[PDB]
């Protein structure tokens, strides 16, 4: 899973990045687990 609007769904090893536009959030992971 690439992006999500549920923080836990990404299973990021580090704190995810939060992108928020109107008042609604998206989370992305910049810490790739190879």
């Amino acid at each position: 899973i690439f992006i999500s609007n549920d923080k836990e769904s990404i299973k990021c090893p580090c704190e995810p990045e939060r992108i928020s536009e109107s008042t609604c959030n998206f989370y992305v992971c910049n810490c790739v687990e190879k």
Partner: antibody
Amino acid sequence: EVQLVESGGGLVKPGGSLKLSCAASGFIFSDYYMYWVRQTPEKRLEWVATISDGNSYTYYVDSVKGRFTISRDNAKNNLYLQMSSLKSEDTAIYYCARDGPTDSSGYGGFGYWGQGTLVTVSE
Amino acid sequence: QSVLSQSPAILSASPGEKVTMTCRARSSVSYMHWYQQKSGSSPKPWIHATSNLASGVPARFSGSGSGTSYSLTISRVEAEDAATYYCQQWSSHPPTFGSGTKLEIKR
């Protein structure tokens, strides 16, 4: 202001065990991942463990797998590090940390560090 | 895995001079962090995400780079800039720290 205050650091014999606390305040503890990072006597910096927020997801550095346990208590705003089967190599200052503020964050950096607590493993 | 080499280990500069220290990664990393450490205290976040200065860090500092080569520059070194600087990445897990560059000031 964000504050992280570690404690529990001490002398412990090889093979012994010990439990560090980190008392977090000035933010919503449960909104953030938490980390332990240590610095050895030679000053090398090493990530040791991560615990996610939401449902516990834990991660470890290999040299510590099966020996350390990171946990958190959102009721009490605390992070912990149960150590056991301690080795002289685990000797270091242990820092608890988290990502930075809302602009400076999301990119895998350690944005706040506590003042650290020293763990000596010796006879 | 994505291990970091920092060079040089020790850098001597006089006040006013420009220094650059550099941080190489074993394979491509996408963001690089830098900390400043003075003894008796813990690492202070200094540059986040390659090129962004942490609140309070003076404008003489900068970070750049991409791929497997990153760096930190001080356009004109000052006495108070004596410290050890460490790079850190987490583009690839587990996160890794370089072993530091110590900056000595000439006087």
